Design a protein around this nucleic acid. Structure first.
Lengths: 122, 7, 23, 107, 502, 529, 232
DNA sequence: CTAATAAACTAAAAACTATTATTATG
DNA sequence: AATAATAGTTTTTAGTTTATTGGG
């Protein structure tokens, strides 16, 4: 939670997402309560501004897709707000959710996928 | 009551 | 919000002006 | 433009919403040469009256402009000729048309 | 700085909005119409900086990016201009709703998930720091989507997720001859009894146009009080009251409405060419000599002390005169940014000066280019209302002190006593004329007239709204509660033939 | 109307000799005359000022004759004060080895008044006397002078370096002379001054004597040629069946600068060479020129600015009646706070002057309102070009007259909702008791109030409202310097300005140790600028 | 007048530098336009927008007498503001952007004006002597060093004084980070050595400064210090 | 035998967020 | 390969314009 440097929560989200991919090495999940704690922290002072929010969501979802479901609308909401690499961060976040792929065509067209897909960045 | 250079 | 105007919450709730009323 | 008679006659377009929207009135008066201004300028002779506003009331208090109804300019336009002022649309006129009314008839 | 307020307005387009138990009462559509017009005017007067939107459902014709059928948006989140007011007043009135029905759809199926989606997208479109998420529906029946259980479930799931994202929906009680009951489809899909047959949702105040204006948590100035020379306290100086006036004349061209550049220029009378700053000397010709000087030392005489506060001492409040009052009182709040630990110190000094009733006289300099005046500091404690909400902030009420040359002379006045019967006469008069004080009941009628005139001319009304002159007594009840007291006191004091004038 | 004030100033070598460590009476008197004369010339006072000087080596008085009226030089007659007066105060005022009876100089300056009080209108004729009371003298004309003063209507004051009866300061709060260092000549002169003033004025004769130090920091220097501010002759109205004339006055009125800095040329030093114009030109299209009426005004309206000329507003705006002071109602005195005191002035209003029935009515107002603890709401309008205002009226009793004070009240638009937090809720910032006791010890050692013994009243060790604005003092200092020294830089800030600005530092010496207690007990970090 | 105005100013700048003396005489009208625009009593634009001074500095025109005369007024105003802001009497011994912009203006204008034919030379000299700190960017001191290097000869007979103080300030400026400071100090120093060499060659008091200031420092020197002594 | 005086009227300067080049590292 | 002044918004605001009485 401490933010004086990006590194703190960067490496922290690294290790916690790794936990989520390695709590009981995914052969079991009884510490899902811990995942609830980290999700509440995601709510805790990262559902207001939500800049490091997308970064930690990034790092945990690369190792653990099934968590961005609680923030789909959130990442849909904040996409127009962001314009830098944050856009790509959000895109990979929603990309991790093939399970979350139920219907996003209407979302992306409403979230104006057209501009970003026309927005040429490799 | 002032008077003069104090007036 | 209690004590806050519903038109502009965060701003104090406004009561109508009454002026002078002898009792 | 097409008819120079409506040129050189300046209108302070402020209120004309009776039967046709204001922008259409502006387009037609631009085509026919009547000059357009949005606030009382230095050569204001006539002011259109289409609705009652505080500003219209203040204009009524003054005696410099012609309380013109848009239907009158429509009649002048479709007849392709400016018609002399006669009272069937008129409330507060200018001293010159006081002279005009006097030389044609009484009030 | 804190975020803004997002006010979302959304009315149904059906026959229920267009009908009433008594059509003399304006239908739910039109009632929502005066509500939105009134809140638009109030926002223009008070907070004409946030963003307001208009959208419809139930209309068989839709217009939205998501292409959700029967979901038609009218106005994006926008500051209310005269354009929005006029384009909503055309449908205002029972004749206006017929025009609405003609040129705009009315009555068709729709899903709450659709409107939640489109409003979430619209909120996603904004690009400003945000604090308030307020959605204000307009409907007179709770069931229509509880009828479709799948629709109700998905709608409540979407609304719950939105309120998790802070999207705060407020129910509007709306008149319905069948009722607008709560706890049937409500109190479980709204974040916050009677069947709400009426339309009471504080709509009275929503129609109450507010002639108010205040900034959003704006800091006035923060200073640093030096105790003697080295020990310093960070303080936030603020006001609970500040003079307001009509906006200054916004100069614009009479032929384009374009603000014309107003550039002034001093130039040489000898040549006509522009005067450089060097070419101009400050002069005050005292006696027969013209004292020539410049600006830098002029302000160095205007300025005498650094921005801050220089304490003079402690003194009981009795050492001040009631007529002694220089400039209107301010409030001082502890500040814990420049100097941390001054909140404990502020509480300690507050309590201690409460005990001894000792005011903190201080040499005060707000900024540069300003003389250090003398100010009295009295502990202004926290006052809690019925709901324990602080109606008086805890801190110091700062009171300002004039100077010897800042007090004009008063010619000697006679103190000729009055008989106790006269005193009792006016005591009865005042007891009849007694009431409580509240500053929200007082205004400047000239300013109110200015506001109403500006509105009604911008609203293109045939007549301006009339300001109420609360600065004039009610002569009827006045003479009712005086009666014989006035002339009795007269004959007690004044000769009957001698009026106080002539 | 003019005032025929004259000065009978001691110039003897007695005061020219300074006591080591104590400012000389000669130099203090020079300080007083300089400050008075700069406040007089800069304000361009019309009251005529003259001057005679005793204790002077030369003698050029019209009352000569030997051993009386001699060693006395009249320098300036009754004309206007100027900067040449400053030059004479600084140059011609020199240590005068000769001494003379100050009574003879009194009679000389009275004859000067009679010489120059004629031919000019005068609402006041005056003399004063600078004297250390140590100059050689013989008390012969003192009662003759008292009679002559009674027969010529000339007022007086005697100044001493000695105090009438805190750190030692000149122009500040504290002692300015040894309390018992006055010589027996000074003591007998003080007795003579006391008897002269108790014969001339009355019980305020001791309220007649003052000193140089309090002169050097206060403005009573201008109290009896003073003319009060313009009154407000109007009529307070009571509903629709009562109305009484008033003569309002503004007791508290912050002083302004009398003259703005006129923008003269730097090549000819003339405003006439400084001609200015305002060019209304369209902010685009290479600044297309706009006629000064072709520019009109608009007003902000929500998301737009509507063109709205002032004429449309004024043709229907509710304008004030004019000079009207209409009461609205009454509220309890507990319902009004100093935070609601609007405006900068204090309307120390009075009823119809010279109307004793109005005085009786006003006394009834004061008594009944005080007994009811009750304030009045009155609508005020300065004139027709002044918008109406609401204000609070509460009684104000002085030892010599009862009166009513009217102060403007706020509107709803004036009020601002500025939210705060609860200081007492800060348990993390709860005041520790040892810190509280250290604060109490500081305040007791920092208190600026002394309970006046053998009385029931309390004093303040730093009375500031009775002191003028310090900025005008140094402002006039630099003004006179620049006038006399345009080539020289402006003079520094005078020490007496600090002395009047600083509080009694003895209280600071008391607070020293509790200051250490506070700084040791309270953690206060600082932020660098 | 904003970032677009800033970019416009620099674009016109680089336009004058690149394209010059082909139609860069249609600018006297524009010169006077900017002169009157800045002479506006309501002078709002930020100190960052004051690179106009370098724009007001002109070398692409043949310079008619008009801007030559206007330059004197420019100089008087600039020395006035330099005096105002250098002294801490304005609560600041600071000049945010004005100083370097004035440096560039005079660099482009003093080329053809104000040699040592007048007193106001040393008057404008007084300002650069104080050049204390520039907070990690160090633009103004190096800029002044360059400006002196351009018009060092315009300051002769008022730099034959304070041999040491100028010596050590040159040493410190050439011995400071932001190497542009170093090279500017070296250029100013070598121009200073040129002028002092010429004057002592024309001073009859040659032996005086010879045994006074040059010989002592040259012996005392023995990174670039020795090279600098070699040059001297 | 002409005369201050608030008042509304400008300027006008300062505080209030608020991003944003900038070394340091390579 | 990063952080740090830093101009861009409000907020009064001291001189300025009107005139309105108060003399003279």
């Amino acid at each position: 939670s401490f933010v004086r440097y990006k590194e703190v929560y960067a490496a922290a989200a690294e290790v916690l997402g790794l936990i989520l991919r390695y709590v009981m090495e995914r052969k079991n999940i009884l510490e899902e309560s811990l995942c609830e704690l980290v999700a509440k922290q995601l709510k805790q002072h990262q559902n207001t501004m939500e800049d490091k929010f997308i970064v930690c969501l990034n790092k945990v979802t690369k190792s653990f897709p099934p968590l961005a479901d609680r923030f789909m609308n959130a990442v849909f909401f904040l996409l127009p707000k962001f314009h830098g690499v944050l856009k790509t961060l959000c895109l990979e976040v929603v990309l991790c959710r093939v399970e979350g792929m139920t219907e996003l065509y209407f979302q992306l067209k409403s979230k104006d996928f057209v501009q970003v897909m026309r927005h040429r960045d490799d | 009551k002032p008077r003069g250079l104090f007036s | 919000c209690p004590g806050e105007s519903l038109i502009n919450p965060g701003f104090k709730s406004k009561k109508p002006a009454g002026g002078v009323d002898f009792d | 433009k097409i008819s120079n008679i409506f040129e050189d006659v300046e209108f302070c377009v402020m209120s004309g919403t009776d039967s046709q929207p204001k922008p259409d009135l502006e387009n037609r008066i631009a085509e026919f040469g009547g000059y357009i201004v949005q606030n009382p300028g230095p050569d204001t002779y006539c002011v259109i009256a289409g609705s009652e506003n505080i500003r219209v009331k203040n204009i009524i208090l003054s005696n410099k402009h012609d309380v013109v109804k848009p239907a009158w300019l429509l009649e002048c336009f479709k007849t392709k000729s400016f018609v002399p002022w006669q009272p069937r649309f008129m409330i507060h006129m200018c001293p010159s048309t006081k002279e005009h009314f006097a030389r044609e008839y009484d009030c | 700085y804190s975020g803004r307020d997002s006010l979302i307005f959304l009315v149904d387009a059906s026959k229920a909005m267009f009908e009433s138990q008594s059509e003399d009462e304006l239908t739910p559509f039109d009632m929502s119409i005066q509500c939105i017009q009134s809140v638009y005017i109030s926002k223009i007067i008070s907070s004409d900086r946030d963003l307001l939107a208009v959208v419809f459902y139930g209309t068989e014709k839709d217009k939205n990016s998501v292409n959700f059928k029967n979901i038609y948006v009218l106005q994006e989140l926008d500051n209310p201009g005269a354009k929005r007011i006029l384009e909503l007043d055309q449908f205002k009135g029972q004749q206006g709703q017929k025009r609405f029905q003609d040129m705009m759809g009315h009555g068709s199926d729709y899903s709450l998930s659709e409107v939640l989606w489109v409003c979430a997208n619209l909120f996603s479109d904004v690009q400003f720091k945000m604090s308030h998420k307020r959605i204000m529906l307009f409907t007179n029946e709770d069931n229509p989507h509880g009828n479709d259980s799948a629709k109700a479930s998905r709608a409540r799931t979407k609304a719950g997720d939105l309120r998790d994202t802070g999207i705060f929906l407020d129910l509007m009680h709306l008149k319905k001859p069948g009722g607008f009951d709560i706890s049937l489809f409500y109190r479980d899909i709204i974040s916050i009894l009677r069947v709400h047959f009426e339309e009471s949702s504080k709509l009275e105040d929503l129609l109450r146009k507010v002639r108010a204006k205040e900034t959003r948590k704006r800091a006035l100035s923060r200073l640093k009080l030096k105790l003697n020379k080295d020990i310093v306290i960070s303080v936030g100086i603020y006001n609970l009251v500040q003079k307001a006036l009509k906006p200054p004349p916004i100069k614009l061209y009479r032929e384009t409405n374009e603000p014309v550049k107003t550039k002034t220029r001093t130039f040489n009378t000898s040549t006509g060419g522009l005067l450089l700053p060097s070419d101009t000397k400050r002069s005050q010709i005292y006696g027969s000599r013209q004292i020539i000087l410049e600006k830098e030392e002029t302000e160095e005489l205007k300025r005498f002390d650094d921005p801050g506060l220089m304490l003079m001492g402690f003194k009981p409040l009795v050492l001040l005169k009631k007529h002694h009052y220089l400039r209107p009182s301010l409030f001082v709040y502890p500040e814990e940014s420049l100097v941390i630990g001054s909140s404990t110190l502020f509480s300690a000094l507050l309590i201690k000066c409460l005990e001894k009733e000792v005011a903190a006289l201080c040499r005060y300099t707000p900024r540069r280019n300003i003389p250090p005046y003398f100010v009295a500091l009295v502990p202004q404690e926290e006052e809690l209302d019925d709901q324990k909400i602080q109606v008086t902030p805890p801190g110091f009420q700062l009171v300002f002190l004039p100077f010897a040359d800042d007090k004009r002379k008063m010619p000697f006045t006679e103190k000729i006593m009055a008989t106790p019967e006269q005193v009792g006469k006016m005591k009865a008069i005042v007891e009849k004329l007694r009431f409580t004080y509240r500053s929200d009941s007082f205004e400047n009628p000239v300013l109110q007239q200015h506001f109403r005139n500006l509105e009604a001319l911008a609203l293109d009304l045939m007549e301006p709204e009339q300001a109420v002159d609360l600065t004039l007594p009610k002569v009827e009840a006045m003479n009712k509660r005086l009666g014989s007291l006035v002339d009795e006191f007269k004959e007690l004091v004044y000769p009957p033939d001698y009026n106080p004038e002539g | 109307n003019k005032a025929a004030v004259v000065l009978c100033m001691d110039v003897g070598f007695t005061m020219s000799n300074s006591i080591p460590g104590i400012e000389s009476p000669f130099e203090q008197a020079k300080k007083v005359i300089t400050m008075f004369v700069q406040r007089q010339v800069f304000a361009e006072n019309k009251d005529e000022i003259a001057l005679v000087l005793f204790g002077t080596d030369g003698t050029d008085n019209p009352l000569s004759g030997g051993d009386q009226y001699q060693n006395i030089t009249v320098h300036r007659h009754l004309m206007l004060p100027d900067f040449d007066l400053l030059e004479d105060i600084e140059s011609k005022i020199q240590p005068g080895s000769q001494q003379a009876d100050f009574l003879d100089a009194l009679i000389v300056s009275m004859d000067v008044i009679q010489h120059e009080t004629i031919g000019k209108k005068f609402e006041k004729r005056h003399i004063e006397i600078f004297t250390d009371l140590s100059s050689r003298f013989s008390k012969s004309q003192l009662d003759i002078i008292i009679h002559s003063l009674k027969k010529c209507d000339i007022s007086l004051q005697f100044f001493l370096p000695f105090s009438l009866g805190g750190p030692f300061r000149l122009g500040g709060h504290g002692p300015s002379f040894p309390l018992k260092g006055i010589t027996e000549q000074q003591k007998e002169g003080l007795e003579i001054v006391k008897m002269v003033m108790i014969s001339l004025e009355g019980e305020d004769g001791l309220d007649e004597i003052y000193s140089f130090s309090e002169s050097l920091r206060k403005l009573c220097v201008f109290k009896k040629i003073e003319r009060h501010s313009i009154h407000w002759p109007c009529r307070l109205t009571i509903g629709s069946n009562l109305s009484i004339r008033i003569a309002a006055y503004k007791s508290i009125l912050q002083e302004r600068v009398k003259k703005t800095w006129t923008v003269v040329d730097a090549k000819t030093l003339k405003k006439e060479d400084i001609q200015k114009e305002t060019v209304y030109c369209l902010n685009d299209d290479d600044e297309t020129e706009v006629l000064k009426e072709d520019i009109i005004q608009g007003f902000r309206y929500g998301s737009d600015i509507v063109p709205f000329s002032k004429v449309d507003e004024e043709q229907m705006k509710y304008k004030s009646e004019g000079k009207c002071f209409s009461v609205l109602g009454f509220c309890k005195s507990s319902q009004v706070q100093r935070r609601f005191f609007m405006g900068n002035q204090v309307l120390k209003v009075f009823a119809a002057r010279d109307d004793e029935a109005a005085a009786v009515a006003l006394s009834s107002l004061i008594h009944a309102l005080d007994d009811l603890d009750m304030v009045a709401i009155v609508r005020y309008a300065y004139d027709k070009r002044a918008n109406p205002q609401v204000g609070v009226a509460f009684p104000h009793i002085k030892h010599n007259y009862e009166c009513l004070v009217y102060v403007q009240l706020p509107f709803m638009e004036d009020l601002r909702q500025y939210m705060f937090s609860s200081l007492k809720n800060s348990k993390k910032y709860a005041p520790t008791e040892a810190q509280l006791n250290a604060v109490d010890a500081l305040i007791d050692s920092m208190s600026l109030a002394k309970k006046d013994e053998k009385t029931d009243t309390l004093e303040d060790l730093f009375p500031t409202t009775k002191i003028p604005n310090p900025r005008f003092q140094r402002l006039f200092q630099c003004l006179l310097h620049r006038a006399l020294h345009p080539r020289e830089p402006l003079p520094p800030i005078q020490q007496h300005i600090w002395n009047m600005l600083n509080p009694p530092a003895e209280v600071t010496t008391k607070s020293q140790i509790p200051l250490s207690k506070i700084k040791t007990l309270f953690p206060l970090i600082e932020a660098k600028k | 007048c904003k970032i677009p105005a800033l970019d416009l100013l620099i674009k016109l700048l680089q336009t004058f530098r690149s394209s010059r003396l082909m139609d860069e005489f249609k600018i006297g009208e524009l010169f006077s336009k900017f002169y009157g625009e800045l002479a506006l009593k309501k002078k709002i634009p930020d100190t960052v927008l004051e690179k106009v001074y370098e724009l007001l500095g002109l070398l692409g025109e043949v310079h008619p007498s008009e801007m030559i005369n206007n330059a004197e007024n420019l100089f008087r105003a600039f020395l006035g503001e330099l005096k105002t802001q250098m002294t801490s009497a304005v609560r600041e011994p600071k000049l945010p952007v004005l100083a370097g912009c004035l440096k560039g203006l005079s660099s482009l204008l003093c080329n053809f004006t104000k040699s040592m034919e007048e007193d106001p030379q040393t008057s404008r000299e007084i300002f650069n002597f104080v050049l204390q700190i520039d907070l990690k960017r160090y633009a103004v001191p190096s800029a002044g060093l360059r400006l002196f290097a351009l018009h060092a000869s315009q300051f002769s007979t008022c730099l034959l004084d304070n041999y040491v103080s100028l010596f050590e300030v040159l040493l410190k400026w050439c011995a400071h980070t932001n190497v542009e400071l170093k090279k500017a100090a070296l250029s100013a120093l070598e121009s200073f050595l040129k002028q002092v060499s010429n004057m002592v060659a024309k001073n009859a008091e040659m032996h005086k400064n010879k045994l006074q200031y040059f010989m002592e420092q040259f012996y005392g020197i023995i990174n670039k210090e020795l090279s600098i002594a070699i040059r001297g």
